[PDB]
Amino acid sequence: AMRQCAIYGKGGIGKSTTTQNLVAALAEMGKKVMIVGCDPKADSTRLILHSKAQNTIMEMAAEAGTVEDLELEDVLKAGYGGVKCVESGGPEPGVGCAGRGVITAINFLEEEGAYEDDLDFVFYDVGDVVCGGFAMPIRENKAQEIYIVCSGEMMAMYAANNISKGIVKYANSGSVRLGGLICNSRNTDREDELIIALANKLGTQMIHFVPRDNVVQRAEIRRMTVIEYDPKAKQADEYRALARKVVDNKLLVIPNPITMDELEELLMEFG
Amino acid sequence: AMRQCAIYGKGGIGKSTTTQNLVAALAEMGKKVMIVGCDPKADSTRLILHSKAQNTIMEMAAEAGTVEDLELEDVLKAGYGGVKCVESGGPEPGVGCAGRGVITAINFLEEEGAYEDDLDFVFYDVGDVVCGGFAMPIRENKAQEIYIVCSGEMMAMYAANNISKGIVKYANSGSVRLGGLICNSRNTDREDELIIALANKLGTQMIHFVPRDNVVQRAEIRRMTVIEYDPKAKQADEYRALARKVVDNKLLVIPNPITMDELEELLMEFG
Numbered sequence: 001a002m003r004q005c006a007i008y009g010k011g012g013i014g015k016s017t018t019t020q021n022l023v024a025a026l027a028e029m030g031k032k033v034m035i036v037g038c039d040p041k042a043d044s045t046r047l048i049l050h051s052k053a054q055n056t057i058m059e060m061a062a063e064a065g066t067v068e069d070l071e072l073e074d075v076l077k078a079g080y081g082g083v084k085c086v087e088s089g090g091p092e093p094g095v096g097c098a099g100r101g102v103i104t105a106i107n108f109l110e111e112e113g114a115y116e117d118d119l120d121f122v123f124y125d126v127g128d129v130v131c132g133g134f135a136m137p138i139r140e141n142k143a144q145e146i147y148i149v150c151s152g153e154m155m156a157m158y159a160a161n162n163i164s165k166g167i168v169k170y171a172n173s174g175s176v177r178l179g180g181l182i183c184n185s186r187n188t189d190r191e192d193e194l195i196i197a198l199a200n201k202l203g204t205q206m207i208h209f210v211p212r213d214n215v216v217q218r219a220e221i222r223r224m225t226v227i228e229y230d231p232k233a234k235q236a237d238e239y240r241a242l243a244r245k246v247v248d249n250k251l252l253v254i255p256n257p258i259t260m261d262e263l264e265e266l267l268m269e270f271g
Numbered sequence: 272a273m274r275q276c277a278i279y280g281k282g283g284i285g286k287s288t289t290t291q292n293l294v295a296a297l298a299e300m301g302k303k304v305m306i307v308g309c310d311p312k313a314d315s316t317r318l319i320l321h322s323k324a325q326n327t328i329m330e331m332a333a334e335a336g337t338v339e340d341l342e343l344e345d346v347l348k349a350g351y352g353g354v355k356c357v358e359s360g361g362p363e364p365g366v367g368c369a370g371r372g373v374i375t376a377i378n379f380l381e382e383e384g385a386y387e388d389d390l391d392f393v394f395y396d397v398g399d400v401v402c403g404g405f406a407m408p409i410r411e412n413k414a415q416e417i418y419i420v421c422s423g424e425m426m427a428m429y430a431a432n433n434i435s436k437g438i439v440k441y442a443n444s445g446s447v448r449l450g451g452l453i454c455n456s457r458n459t460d461r462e463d464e465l466i467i468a469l470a471n472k473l474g475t476q477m478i479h480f481v482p483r484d485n486v487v488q489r490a491e492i493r494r495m496t497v498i499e500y501d502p503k504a505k506q507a508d509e510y511r512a513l514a515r516k517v518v519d520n521k522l523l524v525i526p527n528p529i530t531m532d533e534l535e536e537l538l539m540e541f542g
Contacts, residue, residue, distance in 0.1 A: 010366060065531055095281060095399050095430040097370075128366050132403055159366040260336055 002115065005179065005246070006124035006137050009149035010159040011041070014184045017220055018149055018210055018239075019125045020047040022182075024225035025236075025243035027081025031120045034076075034084040036106060038137050040098035042089040044125035048079035050223045056087040057108050058101040062094050072112045080228050084114070099133030102126070106137060128159050130166030138176045145179040145252060147207065150198075152183075152191035154267060157198060161263060164202050164255040177252035180207030182242065194270045201262065202255040208242040211235065273386065276450065276517070277395035277408050280420035281430040282312070285455045288491055289420055289481055289510075290396045291318040293453075295496035296507075296514035298352025302391045305347075305355040307377060309408050311369035313360040315396035319350035321494045327358040328379050329372040333365050343383045351499050355385070370404030373397070377408060399430050401437030409447045416450040416523060418478065421469075423454075423462035425538060428469060432534060435473050435526040448523035451478030453513065465541045472533065473526040479513040482506065 009015045016039070023033050024047075037044035037054070045054050057075050064070060076086050088105035089098045106124075109115070115122065124137040130146070137143055146167060150160040160181060167178050183195040183206055192209040199206045215236075219229035226236050280286045287310070294304050295318075308315035308325070316325050328346050335341060347357050359376035360369045377395075380386070386393065395408040401417070408414055417438060421431040431452060438449050454466040454477055463480040470477045486507075490500035497507050 062531070094433075095426060096433055097400055097402065099368075100402060129368055131368065131371060155366060162365075162367055260333070 002119045002122060003145060004122045004124075004143040005145040005147060006126055006143040007147055007149060007182075008126050008128070008130065008163045009182075010128050010156055013149060013151050013153070013156050015149040016044045016125055017047065017216060018182060018184055019044060019123060021216075021225045021227060021239045022242050022246065023083055023121075023123055024048060024080050024227040025239035026121060026247070027083050028227050028231075029240070029243065031247070032082065032118050033121045033123060034086065034114065034119060035123050035125060036109070036137070037085075037087040037089060038102040038105075038124050038126040038134065040089045040092075040101075040127075042087040045079070045085035045087060046223060047220060047225050048083045049077060049085050050079065054085060054087040056089055057105040058088055058090060058098070059092070061104070070108065072109075072114060075108075076114055080225060086114070097133070101133075103133055103136045106142070110141075128163065130163055130170065135166065135170065139171070140174050142176075144175055145177060147179045147182055147246070149182045149184055150195065151186050152194050152270065153186065157195075157263060157267070158260065160198065161202070161257050161260075164257040167255055168257060178202070178204050178255045179246070179249060179252055180205050182206075182208055182210060184210050185212040190270060194266065197266055198258075198263075201258050201266070203253050204255060205251055207245050207249065208238070210238055210242065273390045273393060274416060275393045275395075275414040276416040276418060277397055277414040278418055278420060278453075279397050279399070279401065279434045280453075281399050281427055284420060284422050284424070284427050286420040287315045287396055288318065288487060289453060289455055290315060290394060292487075292496045292498060292510045293513050293517065294354055294392075294394055295319060295351050295498040296510035297392060297518070298354050299498050299502075300511070300514065302518070303353065303389050304392045304394060305357065305385065305390060306394050306396060307380070307408070308356075308358040308360060309373040309376075309395050309397040309405065311360045311363075311398075313358040316350070316356035316358060317494060318491060318496050319354045320348060320356050321350065325356060325358040327360055328376040329359055329361060329369070330363070332375070341379065343380075343385060346379075347385055351496060357385070368404070372404075374404055374407045377413070381412075399434065401434055401441065406437065406441065410442070411445050413447075415446055416448060418450045418453055418517070420453045420455055421466065422457050423465050423541065424457065428466075428534060428538070429531065431469065432473070432528050432531075435528040438526055439528060449473070449475050449526045450517070450520060450523055451476050453477075453479055453481060455481050456483040461541060465537065468537055469529075469534075472529050472537070474524050475526060476522055478516050478520065479509070481509055481513065
């Protein structure tokens, strides 16, 4: 039945290209998906939708100044492989925060009925923490699986450890676990091992090493996924291996976060 | 006894210069104050402290990697007129959010005992919303008074209305009210009237019109308040009138926020 997954990690490492390309690889093997963009910089769906940008719930709300007065097809549009896309996030142009804009958006979706029967997966592309307004895409009637995108960079890994402290310190004993660490490459054979090393430190797995290949940037300036743009590329089979691993994955763990002294040790040992 | 006030409003309108200059005008008439910077861009105390920047609780924490292992005089320093200064805010350099960094900071302060007997005023320089982690400086054992700094600018006023919706929708019936609207000038005699017009719409008062005068920028590049730098300036008596009005103010109201249709009407009518 409908698994609910959520992709956390920091910005600037390509987390949203990985999310779309995995979602496209899932669409392609028969799965029915919805992407829900819980990102202030709302951009998690342009590669599935071939969009300049997708209009958000928190921008079609203040626009029409609502309480309970917007529709589903005004915000949930379909794209590659029949994947359904929602944006939320940003107050932009208005003021405030975007974390609350996630709650006044997936609530719209629940009450609007977008979580229908044959949906296999719902993906939440959220951010740097598992707290309050950005932990909402992970509570009781929500995400039971969390995958962290990181890389062999100090800040990226420190965000992967801090997102993990938020998964253990979640508002009492519901079920939201850690599925794995997806790694978005930057260098050769001792970066995958560093993320495997952090994975084993926190009690998870590096569920896939996404290589750095040029087909990816060539697909995203042309507004597509590598699965759509070049289905025959080697990288295209990276997102299929990631997808099959996500589908079939059973290790959902409660992570054991490390000290920034321990993480200093790991980064000293690598670079 | 110790009144707890909190200054909200948007960024870029000079809210933090007004806060320091009012706090200095209060120091000067005998009052004992503490400024507590609950701002991500932690800069609410450089004019009282004559500081390049003040080291934050959420920067002396990760630095010394703490749980319960930092001291008070490592973060609370005194400045003009004996005003006591604290910074908190930012994760900077680390990742995450700064809203939670306000809770893991005034909690430090309570447990550390900075709210001593002869403190007349505690001021919280916070931001754009009265929600969760930035509403914490306003709950039960905290701020009972809220002053919003704004101006005759679309976004500034829209933030003053939205901070007001957060004061009415606060987590049940404790006491945190709206003290008034401080206006930081930009133009002549129909801007003070516009903020008076919004004040009366929400059921408060424009408690003071802070004029635009050059002595202010000349005092802040020299890292002081106008009360310290030129006590004899006309603007120096603006912050004294504001200060006496804050001391003596009794209208603490539960605001009645307007629609963005009503605020469109007010801005059409002015500019």
